[PDB]
Design a protein around this ligand. Structure first.
Ligand SMILES: Nc1ccn([C@@H]2O[C@H](COP(=O)(O)OP(=O)(O)OC[C@@H](O)CO)[C@@H](O)[C@H]2O)c(=O)n1
Ligand SMILES: [Cl-]
Ligand SMILES: [Cl-]
Ligand SMILES: [Cl-]
Ligand SMILES: [Cl-]
Ligand SMILES: [Cl-]
Ligand SMILES: [Cl-]
Ligand SMILES: [Cl-]
Ligand SMILES: [Cl-]
Ligand SMILES: [Cl-]
Ligand SMILES: [Cl-]
Ligand SMILES: [Cl-]
Ligand SMILES: [Cl-]
Ligand SMILES: [Cl-]
Ligand SMILES: [Cl-]
Ligand SMILES: [Cl-]
Ligand SMILES: [Cl-]
Ligand SMILES: [Cl-]
Ligand SMILES: [Cl-]
Ligand SMILES: [Cl-]
Ligand SMILES: [Cl-]
Ligand SMILES: [Cl-]
Lengths: 410, 411, 401, 411
């Protein structure tokens, strides 16, 4: 009677007798043996099961088409509030079926850390797409982490533990690769430079019009109007009053309305807390709240330019060689010269840094002029970051997985 | 009615017993610890996490032994075979089956430091915390960062709070410390006992006891015509290098010290244990005495004509003697410059000269009458503030509190 | 406040979990079983330690199913898969976790034998015991010796006493029985219910329902032309009755049903007796057999009281009446004197006598009635009702405060 | 990592520790009992389950004292206090820590009745079973039916058989017993040692030691000019009534015996312990002497001129002396008629008459020499069948087998 089993065993009796909600887990930890793995089961979860979205979605939609005959399982916080096309069946996180799915599967696909209490056996292949070309230092590369409940050495310890299990790790470029290699204690061997499966549409579908037209009318958009997308990153300094009434975005909608309300419509992609605290009465058909829209890649395809600040998205939107603007209004707060960025913000991004909305508004009046004026820099940026993207990524993984599970079938 | 907390313990205990864990003794303690095992006549002592027989618990014990021989005394140690206790008390080793018994049974716990959180203080038992000194560096609640491993500033304070909340009485040296303790240790003034330290009763009761002074001086093979400097620097992390095999000679420069005072003085080195077995006192025999391992620091104080220190709470204890004090604070540059991470204004109201190099100090030390005269005011005012409390009856107060506390129980 | 029973149940349960013991199911239930677990509308049934869907619990249940259909019904079986149950009732396998959940939850236990002492009967649940017939041999307390396997007479009685005290209500057939129960089972008459046995409903209500009789007989493939003799020995440690002879004697008017013991049943090579001797041991409702039975042959069995309700003839073929303590008092009633039929120790004159049933009927009509009037004058066929109701009423009170 | 059998004990012992159970002493023993605990020169004696210091164990031990005073001898008692042991031996109270230490450490076990199944006779130790006498009633296996509450017949035998399989050596006093033991105890003849009983030594070596006979007689304050009769009825349940407060005078009728034998006899009454403390011998002073509580029955025999008894194993021990026996079997009809619940044929091959009324017994008893003669024939035949195997050296034999065993175990 082995000491490791005895421990798991007592823990479960505790959970069973005490009616702990965790019993579902302790039972799993016990019975989870290498033999439960059915070589043709695949589980997908995206952003820790809040969504059917991002690269796991596109890897899934590719495999549905060309490999219908596998068990496809999706993992969700609230399965019944998530709509999935196809042969996939869904599971609630932390439930009986959840641990089954994860025990049986030959392959794990996801774009974020999956929990450590989940047992990744030698048997199974865990493929990590992750969720973007980094601009802020992550994991190992961070210096201090005053994050509640844990120290920094511990938080790195646990991260290091997750990444050690990543059999494959996708990368959108050389620069992300070099970073991952250190940030995620990764081996170049295990890294796949192919680009993001979720970016595939940015290459394949950008000139598809019936498609652009759906997305546009699914959003009820003006027909004559060009589209600006605004997508600021989150900031604590701006959460006040429990989040009931916020101070109008510093971008100044009133102004943008006056200045561009006739040529443009503007898409506000905000953090969910800002979203449902944002009053847009008086801007109908001008500023559209687009914060809860399922698929961000679709929003990029219909955008004529992106306004952002410090985001992993500028790297995505780059694939389309369109104009970007960076409205870093609080940029002085951010550490004076901040090396807490991998890249050189001041120097090499595809657009102007504005710190005030009004130069930004004038500039927007005439896009074609910004496109020319910055064509040089857009290109340099496209070369450095977005050139790796075939439009073939979701196919490459779907095939890697297919090839993978032909062997196990013996 | 399912008893869920009991079930929990039974499981931990089974786990330990089956797995051959050393803590089987602890989990059994916890499972069975009934409020009934308390026996009014039993008292446990330990000082400094049970490394010693020393400090205030020692002096409380030796008092009660003389007037209250009748009670059951227990001392807890890390290593009992290496510690000698006068009197009737029995000695338990920490974490041992006997140790948990002692703590289960005692009506009274007496220590000068934190006792573990796994021990249970039943409402049945009185925990008397003497603590261990008038504070200079800010402690517990009043800190600002605890970059100390496995644990964060908040969970460190959380645990400290758990501990201080089991203190039935806490001993205070002066109004100053009381102020602090209230905040730093989240304490009720109701529970504070401004009486001075049972360990400084010898600094009041026995300064003029010329025979007792001699024991101490001969216990330490001291040359006879020589006056005595004691040196007691706090521990510095920085100054540790090379596995601690050879240290760069103390910055107080013994060699100069010899050449200036080798004739008239002898100097007692109260170093931290790691520096102490790294000292090379070859060539200073009969001048530099190691005294790091001396059982009773207060006895040292008694035979010391002056003290050199820096950022320690000992200056507060040695104050009762109204003797000279020097603060060789050489590394003060690298201590926040103008800092208030000390409760009191270190730059102004200590009882002596601050010296950043040892040469002005060494010279100064030639003439001890000129110092005493010079700083006498700074010295008297230091005393009026931090030492106006000790009447040398601290040991007595506590034993009578214990005995009074326990008559009650016998009805 | 050290809960010491709890502490023992935990250790036992941990010992089970670790040494992969089958009883882990049970020690879990013992730990967790609480009064709150009880749901007022859950009822459990088991007959004969869970081998059948049969007699008094079956009838109680078949009644309750028809009138109070919205309660949660559960049946306990040694093997649920080999037992068909009518209605909404779910089945549970003994010692399975569903078994314990079920006895823990249920507000009423209904059975006709002893239920295990490792099951807990709370101050909260109501255990209705129907037992299983009007006694002939002494049982329970009244016994003298029981050198039975791995148990001393008293420890056997200590444990009987333990069970019988859990009994909330205990069903009686006759004052004779009640006076016997009160002593045998340590019972207080307050808890006794002289209302007859529910399984003997049919033996009164459908005693003339011909179309029903006809389904029973053809559910058994019986001769359209013969009278039916039922032979129901009681258990002992070719047949004594001489089949070769009964055939030669009664082949022309009778066919004979043999209801033996499962282990003697599948040792009976009834070849050359097909269409005459019908093994009927593994049949379910014994009451249906009585209904189609023209007379009964038994010996020392409590079925003789059930069958008497029909006022038909009985023959007692007691071949081992010698090796039964000569003049035996081990019988609550006087066996040699008052019973509704002739005692035979040889099966040969039993046969001749049995050739014409009607001489026997008259020759014993006085004795037969005297029997009906002592032991059967209390069976109203309303019994299933009375219980079914009692339980229904019982779960109203406990569904109000 | 952990084996099933050890887990089970571990858990049993936790149950005993937590529940302050008297049996914790045992649970420990069972966990900690190693084949390695043994010390070859430790020997444990216990007789009649620790009731006594007595028969075979005593004499084997007393012999091993004189000739091997060098070993560790331990005696086991229910109450070590109420028992006096001569010699080096230390004593131990059954079920104390000491007690299990003893049976754990001992190379040899000497006993005359069953020792508990819960003690582990390691493959390392030699359990020598002397037993307590030639059977007349059927035992263990041959017993037909036993309604002893708490256990069923087959359980009883399984449990006896477990215990006999633990015996490395079974002493026998005759072939009669050997053929019996072989069956009744499930014995392999290899293990049986017909050497006679060590308690019977003195019945041979000392039948004539007049300085010694006298020492017994005068330890009992026996008259000078008077012969000794011994009576030794076995116990009967029938006679127990009324809290055992007031019994009915013996069937043997004392008042008669006094009238008849008085001027020439004194009668030693060896009754059951319960009949003794209930018997009123007032007015019979100097005639009937209560002798129930005597530490050594063999001494009693040495001094008796004859021995009245009934259905008892003692007739065989007395047989050695070739003296008259009577059998006052006053309830012989009750006892299973012509019972075969005995081994030997009762109505024939015992060395004296069977009386059922005690009045002919008494008269016949008036002239011993007529009986010694009229029955010399039956006495000698009896002596041959049952007593012609006692060298007087039984304890020496055992003593020396033990010594031998612990020479080889010494390497
Ligand atoms: N050959 C038989 C005997 C009995 N039974 C059924 O089992 C019950 C018990 O009858 P007994 O032969 O006496 O068996 P026993 O378990 O000893 O019951 C007798 C005692 O319980 C009276 O209270 C009967 O009422 C009858 O319904 C049956 O199907 N076939
Ligand atoms: Cl192991
Ligand atoms: Cl949901
Ligand atoms: Cl993540
Ligand atoms: Cl893992
Ligand atoms: Cl990222
Ligand atoms: Cl973490
Ligand atoms: Cl690069
Ligand atoms: Cl706004
Ligand atoms: Cl418990
Ligand atoms: Cl006390
Ligand atoms: Cl030690
Ligand atoms: Cl000591
Ligand atoms: Cl301090
Ligand atoms: Cl130095
Ligand atoms: Cl309910
Ligand atoms: Cl089944
Ligand atoms: Cl035990
Ligand atoms: Cl030895
Ligand atoms: Cl004792
Ligand atoms: Cl053994
Ligand atoms: Cl013989």
């Amino acid at each position: 009677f082995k000491v490791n089993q005895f421990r798991k065993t007592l823990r479960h009796v505790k959970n069973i007798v005490l009616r702990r909600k965790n019993k579902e887990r302790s039972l799993y930890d016990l019975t989870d043996k290498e033999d439960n793995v059915k070589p043709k089961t695949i589980v997908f979860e995206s952003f820790g099961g809040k969504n059917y979205s991002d690269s796991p979605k596109y890897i899934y939609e590719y495999m549905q088409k060309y490999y219908p005959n596998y068990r496809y399982i999706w993992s969700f916080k609230n399965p019944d509030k998530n709509v999935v096309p196809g042969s996939a069946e869904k599971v609630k996180r932390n439930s009986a079926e959840y641990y089954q799915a994860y025990s049986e599967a030959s392959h794990w696909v996801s774009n974020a850390r999956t929990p450590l209490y989940l047992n990744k056996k030698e048997n199974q292949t865990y493929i990590q797409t992750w969720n973007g070309t980094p601009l802020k230092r992550l994991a190992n590369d961070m210096k201090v982490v005053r994050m509640p409940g844990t120290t920094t050495p511990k938080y790195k310890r646990n991260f290091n533990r997750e990444t050690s299990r990543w059999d494959y790790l996708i990368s959108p470029n050389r620069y992300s690769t070099e970073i991952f290699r250190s940030a995620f204690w990764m081996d170049e061997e295990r890294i796949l430079e192919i680009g993001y499966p979720r970016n595939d549409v940015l290459v394949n579908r950008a000139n598809d019009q019936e498609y652009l037209d759906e997305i546009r009318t699914h959003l009820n958009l003006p027909s004559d109007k060009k589209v600006i997308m605004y997508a600021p990153t989150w900031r604590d300094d701006e959460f006040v009053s429990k989040g009931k009434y916020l101070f109008e975005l510093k971008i100044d909608l009133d102004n943008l309305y006056k200045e561009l309300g006739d040529d443009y419509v503007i898409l506000l992609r905000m953090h969910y807390l800002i979203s449902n605290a944002l009053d847009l009465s008086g801007y109908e058909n001008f500023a559209i709240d687009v914060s809860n829209y399922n698929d961000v890649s679709e929003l990029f395809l219909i955008s004529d330019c992106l306004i952002t600040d410090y985001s992993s998205v500028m790297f995505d939107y780059g694939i389309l060689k369109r104009p970007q603007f960076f409205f870093a209004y609080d940029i002085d707060k951010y550490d004076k010269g901040l090396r807490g960025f991998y890249m050189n913000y001041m120097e090499d991004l595809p657009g102007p840094i504005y710190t005030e909305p009004y130069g930004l508004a004038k500039e927007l009046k005439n896009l074609d002029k910004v496109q020319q004026q910055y064509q040089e820099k857009i290109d340099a940026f496209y070369d450095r970051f977005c050139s790796v993207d075939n439009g073939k990524a979701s196919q490459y993984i779907g095939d890697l997985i297919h090839k993978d599970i032909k062997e196990q079938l013996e």
